[PDB]
C-alpha cells in the first residue's frame, strides 16, 4: 500500500486505517496539509498515530502518506550556521521562503537547501573499483573557511566504487557515488539520513585524556573537564549561564559547537538568536564569526512537545555526525529540566504510570542513554581519525534544590558539576562558580596529561584546594592562610570577562599564577615557623606584584612567563628578612 | 478561496452522555468542526466536535444537553473550524466569551476570519523587548517595570484586590498606538458589572476591547476566550502596527475550565487533578506574545491568577513560572493593613527589568533608584522586627532613620490611591523624595554621577 | 473545620462568592461567639457600599479602615509577645495592644442568647466603633509628649464605660445616642488633663 | 521523626508550623546578637 | 553596677543561644523531614488512583467491544 | 573472572536476564564443578528500574513508588541463589551493589533487599566527604552471620563480644555529637568527652585502610582493642568480666 486513510481523530491521536505495511515509530503525513505524525500503536490493519501539530480540521478520509523512515535528521553540507527546531526544519529558511512570522503548520521544507552548490573534491586514491566500507571518508566539501565538511559513507552499506564524481560543483540531490554490491548498484548523494534514537556506529571507545580549556582560571585549573566528558550546571536566572554557554563556544579547543535550546522561553530564546549570530572568534588570521562552526537547535515552549523531546536527540545526532569526521565536538544542552517536563507530557498523553514525582518510569534510562553518547572515540573508517563529543547539560531544578527526580538522576551520571551560585553573582564575584559543592571526577584521568605536559601543576591544586577547605572553618571562628586565600579568591578565581586580556587566559598563565601564590604561601609558612604583622606591612609591594599578575596581555607571550620568573625571585629575598 | 457547498443537517443522534452528544451516519466529519444544534423547542445551541471515529462524530454542545432529544434534534454542520470575525472596530466594544456582543451594539464586520487556535510564532524572527510600558501603578512600574513584549503574571490570592487593580492597569497604560485587549474569564456578576462600568465609564473605551465570560456562562466558552483574546491582539499587533497589552484575569479559573473538558472526554487526571498537557495549553496562550522584527507592533501579557491557599507549589502558579518572565506578588498582610495596591516588593521581581529602563527609555537614574528603593526596604524590614525585640529607642542610631522610611515607603509610595494616575516621572520624584532621607554616602548602590544630579533639590 | 482553602467544594466556592465569613476553630475552642476570624474573611462589597455609607452613616468608613488596622497590628505583636515575652516592647504600640483587646471582647464578642445582644442595630454598632476608636486617637496623641501604666486604672471608670456599652436595650432610640455622646465627652475631659 | 497523619491538610499545617519556626529562630537570632553586642561593649567598659 | 550586669547577661545569653540551637537543629529538621514525608505520601496515593481509574478505562473498552 | 557487561546504551529488557545468566553460570561453576564463586551484581538499583519500566508497560499492580507488586519475589529469585549445599564442596556468595535513591534507606530498593538478604553494608556520604577511605559507617550495617563465623574454633573468642561493645561506644558517642550541636562544646561532662574522643579516633584508625592494604582479623582486633583502651574500665558494659580481664592490660 502507498496511502492510508484517517478513520478517526480524537485529539493528538489519529487511528489511521488501511496501513498494513506500517512499522513502529515511522513518520507519516496526515491530511492534505501534511501534518507530521508518529506511529505509536499497531492494531492489525489500523495504526494509532499521534500527530505533532494541532489536528484541527482533519476529516475522516484524508490521505495519510507514510514515509518508511523513523524520526531522523538530514546530515550533509549546509548545516553550519543554520537554525533548526527539534524535528530539523530550518527556521532561517522558513522565514524567507514564506515571508511570514508564524510557522505555517504544514510546510515540509527540506532541512538542507537543495539550491546552494558546494565544491566537491574526491578522496584522491579512492579509485573506481576500490573496496569501501561504511564510515570511510569519501570526499571533502569546503563548507566555510573553518569547517572542511568531509563527506562520509553511511555506516549501513558497503561495496566497490563504480561511479565517482569528478571535482566540481554539485547540488545536494546530485548523485555523487554508486556502489557495486552483490545485489544492486546502489547510488546515494551527499546527504545521509540517520535516526536520532539509534546510536552512530563506531569502532572502539577510548578513555578521554585531553582537557577542555574553556578559558576561565577556576574552571581549567581547579575543576577541569576533559573533551569526551559530561558536565552539569545549575539553571537559575542570573548566575553565570550566559557566560559558560558562550565562553565555551568562543575560546575552547573545540572544532564545532552545537547548542540545543530545548524548550527554553520566548525572549530567552530570542536573545540567543540575537547574540550567537554576532559573536566573534579569533583564529590565527583575522577574526571571523562564530556562526561558521555553530549549529543551533532553537525551540520555544509554544512549539509541539514531540519537537521538544526530540530536540535533545536531534542535537546529539548532529554532534555525533561531526564527531566521525575527526573533529572535537562539544554540545551544550540548555536545558535538560525543560526536556524532562517534555517527557512528562509525552508519557502523560499515553496515560502511563507516573513513577517518581510525575516523571515516567524511563526518566533515569533516557538520560543515561543520552549522556553515554559522549566520549573520545576512534571513529569508523580507513583514514583512522579520532573524535570526541562533550555534553554540557544545564539543570533547572524547582527552587534550586538538588533533591529532585531529574536533578539527582543527572548528578549520578555527570562527572563535572560546575556549581554556579546566585549568591556569588549577587556580590559580583564573576564567574560565580562555587568551590564547595562543585567537583570533578576527572582528576585521576588527567594527571597523565599533567605529567607529560605541565609537570608542576598537581602539587599545587591538591594543596590550594585544602587552603580553600581550611578557610571555611577558619571563617566560622592560620592567619597566614586567611590572607592568601583572599588573594586567590580575588585575583585567581575571580575573572572579569570584559578586560581585553582577562576574558581568556591560556593554561601556562593559569599554572603560572597558582605557582606564585603557593610559593608565596609555603615560604610564609616557614617565615612564621621560625612574624605575621611585619609580613603584612613590609611585603606590601610584592603583594602588589602578585595581585597585578593577571594583566599579562596577549602581546606579551614569552614575557608573561619572563615576568613570572622575576616576580618569583623577588619573593625569595624578603622571606629571609 | 471559500466554500460554497450547502450544509448537511443530520437528524441521527445516537446518544447523549452528559455534556456531549454522539452522532451517527455522519459522512467525512472534521475535528473541531463547529455544529449548530436545534432543539425540538426551537432553541439554537452551538457545539464543537471533539472526537470522530469512522462514521460517528461525538460533538459536545456549549450550553448543556438539558432538554435535548433523540428523535427530533437536527444537527446541522458547518464545514470549517471556529473562526472569529476580527476587525479594527472591536476597540471600545464588549462581547461575551464566544464573541457575540453584550454592549447592545451590532455584530462585528470583519476584514478577515482568523483561526482562533492560531499558529506558533517563529523563534528566529522574534526580537528582544527593550522599551517600557508606563502602566501607572508606582509599585509596579517603579521597581519591577514591564518591558514591551514581556509576559508577567500577578500572583494574587482568593480575596485580595486583584480585579480591582487589574482595572487600574487597563486604564492608565502606555505612552506613545496603545490598544488594550481585556479578557475576563470566570468572574462574578458584581465583578462583571464593575468591569463594564469602571472601564466603560471613563474614557478608556476608545482603545480597550474588553470581552468577558461570566461564571454562569458555559465552561467551553472559557477555553475559547483566551483564544479569542490573543487572535485579535495579534491582529492588532502583527497585522496593524499597534502596541497591545493583554490582561488575562482569573487564570486559575481558566485551568478549572480545562479540567472539566479534559474529564468530559474520559481522560485520566494528571498531577493534582489538572491534566498532563496543561504545560502546552498554557504555553499556547502565554507564548503568543513578544515583538517581531518585520513590524514595529508588540503584544504584552499580564495574566492575573489566584494561587489557592498561598501555595506556589500548586500546578497553576508553578507551570506559569516556567513560561512567563517573573512574578508580581500581591500580599495579604499588606492588604489587611489597608494600603490599597498590596504589591509586595521583596518576593516580586521583573525579569526583563534591566532591558526595559535606561536613559533612552525613561530616565538615567531609573536603573539605580530602583536598586536602592528595594535595598533600603530590605534593611527597613528587619529593623521593624528589631523594634519589638529590644525597644524603640535603645537599638541603634542607624535604625532610627530606616524605620521612618518604611512608614513613608508603605504609605506614600506603594499606597497609590484608587484613581490616582502616576507617570514614570511622577514615580521617581517620589522615589527621590524618600531618598531625601538617608543622606549621601549611605545610598551605596547609586553611583556618584547620578547621585550628585538628582539628590540636591 | 478542616480543608480551609484546599477543598474542592470550598475552592470552587471562593471563586464565585463575594463575601466569606470564615468560622474559625481556634476561637471556638475558647468559645468566642461568633467564631469569625477577621483575617482570612473578606467582603468584595466595600466599593458598592460607600455610596450608601456617605449618605446615611458618614462617620463609619474612616472608622473601619482603622478598625481593621488595629486587629492586624495586634496580630503580629501576639507573635512577638509569645516568644520574647511581654516587656511591652513600646508604649505607642502597647495602647494598640489593649484597645484591640477592648475590640476582641466587647465589640467582636456577641452572645446571642441575651435579650439585648441577640440583635444589635447599626447605630449601636457604629456607636461602639466611634467610641472605641476615639479612645485610640486620643491616647495616641497622649504619648506624643505620660504612659499607659498610669492611664489603665486612672481611666478605669472610662474603660468600664466602654466595656459596658454593649448592654443597652435595643429599644432605647435616642437614649443610646445620648449615651454615645455622653461617654465620648467624658473621654474628652480625661485627655484634657 | 514523623508527627501526624499525612496526605491532606497536614502539609498546610506543617507549612504554617515551619514558617513560624523559621522566622522564630531569626527573631531570636537578632535577640542573641544584640545581647552579645551589649555584652561586647560592656566588656571594654 | 556593671559587674552585676556582666554575669547576668551570660546567664541570659546561654539560655537564649540554646533555644536558637534547639530550633535550628531539633525542631526545624523534625518539621522539615516530616514535610518531605507528606509529599511522598500524597504521591503514593496520587498514583494509586491512577491505577484504579485506568483499570476502569480498560474495563469500559472491553465491555464496549463485547457489545460490538 | 566471568565479566558480564551490559552498558547504559544496551536495551532495557536485557537488564532483566543479565543477573539471571550471571547466577546460572555461577550455579554451574559451583554446585556442579565444586569451586567457590563470588558473584557481584553491579547496580542492583539499576536492575530494578529496568523491572519497573517493563511492568508499567504491562500495566499491572503498582506497589510502593511505582515498583511492581512482585518486586519482592523477582529480587528474591536472584538473591536466594546462594549458600552451600550438603553433597558439594562448592559455594556461591553474593555481594550485590545497589544505589539507594536520595540517600533514603526507606526507599523500596534498599528496603526489599534488606528483608531478603542476610545483612547489609552501608557506605556513608558524610565519611566520604572527610576523605575516609572505605567510607563506611557501622551503625546501620549489620551482618546476620556474625554470630556463627566467630568463636574459639573459628576466630579469637573476644572478637564476637568486642563488636557488641564497639557498637555501644559508637552509638552512645553518635548521640554526643547530636548533643554537642545544641548546648555547647563546654557543657559536656567527663564521661561524654571520651565518647567524642573515641568517635574522632574511631573513623580514622579503625577504618580508612587505603586502597591497596589488607589487614587480617588479628590485625583488626589488635588495632580495635587499642580504641577501647582510651576508655576506662567499667564503662564497657557489653563485655563480661571473664573476657575483659585478659585483653585490657596490654
From Swiss-Prot, chain B:
Record's bilayer topology term: Peripheral membrane protein
Keyword field: ATP-binding, Cell membrane, Cytoplasm, Cytoplasmic vesicle, Hydrogen ion transport, Ion transport, Membrane, Nucleotide-binding, Synapse, Transport
CC annotations in GO: apical plasma membrane; clathrin-coated vesicle membrane; cytosol; melanosome; plasma membrane; synaptic vesicle membrane; vacuolar proton-transporting V-type ATPase, V1 domain
Keyword Metal-binding: no
SUPFAM superfamilies: P-loop containing nucleoside triphosphate hydrolases
Places the protein is found: Apical cell membrane; Melanosome; Cytoplasm; Cytoplasmic vesicle, Clathrin-coated vesicle membrane
Residues annotated to bind ATP: 351
Tissue: Expressed in brain (at protein level). Expressed in all tissues tested, but highest in brain and in adrenal medulla.
GO molecular function, one term: ATP binding
Single GO BP term: proton transmembrane transport
Any single Pfam family the record assigns to this protein: ATP-synt_ab
Function: Non-catalytic subunit of the V1 complex of vacuolar(H+)-ATPase (V-ATPase), a multisubunit enzyme composed of a peripheral complex (V1) that hydrolyzes ATP and a membrane integral complex (V0) that translocates protons. V-ATPase is responsible for acidifying and maintaining the pH of intracellular compartments and in some cell types, is targeted to the plasma membrane, where it is responsible for acidifying the extracellular environment.
Subunit and interaction comment: V-ATPase is a heteromultimeric enzyme made up of two complexes: the ATP-hydrolytic V1 complex and the proton translocation V0 complex. The V1 complex consists of three catalytic AB heterodimers that form a heterohexamer, three peripheral stalks each consisting of EG heterodimers, one central rotor including subunits D and F, and the regulatory subunits C and H. The proton translocation complex V0 consists of the proton transport subunit a, a ring of proteolipid subunits c9c'', rotary subunit d, subunits e and f, and the accessory subunits ATP6AP1/Ac45 and ATP6AP2/PRR.
Family: Belongs to the ATPase alpha/beta chains family.
PANTHER family named among the record's database cross-references: V-TYPE PROTON ATPASE SUBUNIT B (PTHR43389), V-TYPE PROTON ATPASE SUBUNIT B, BRAIN ISOFORM (PTHR43389:SF5)
Matches recorded under HAMAP family: ATP_synth_B_arch (MF_00310)
Name of the molecule in the record: V-type proton ATPase subunit B, brain isoform
Taxonomic source organism: Bos taurus
UniProtKB/Swiss-Prot annotation, chain C:
Tissues showing expression: Expressed in brain (at protein level).
Location(s), subcellular: Cytoplasm; Cytoplasm, Cytosol; Cytoplasmic vesicle, Secretory vesicle; Cytoplasmic vesicle, Clathrin-coated vesicle membrane
Quaternary assembly: V-ATPase is a heteromultimeric enzyme made up of two complexes: the ATP-hydrolytic V1 complex and the proton translocation V0 complex. The V1 complex consists of three catalytic AB heterodimers that form a heterohexamer, three peripheral stalks each consisting of EG heterodimers, one central rotor including subunits D and F, and the regulatory subunits C and H. The proton translocation complex V0 consists of the proton transport subunit a, a ring of proteolipid subunits c9c'', rotary subunit d, subunits e and f, and the accessory subunits ATP6AP1/Ac45 and ATP6AP2/PRR.
Family, as annotated: Belongs to the ATPase alpha/beta chains family.
Function: Catalytic subunit of the V1 complex of vacuolar(H+)-ATPase (V-ATPase), a multisubunit enzyme composed of a peripheral complex (V1) that hydrolyzes ATP and a membrane integral complex (V0) that translocates protons. V-ATPase is responsible for acidifying and maintaining the pH of intracellular compartments and in some cell types, is targeted to the plasma membrane, where it is responsible for acidifying the extracellular environment.
The protein, known as: V-type proton ATPase catalytic subunit A
Native source organism of the sequence: Bos taurus (Bovine)
Parent-protein start and end of this portion: 413 to 612 of 617
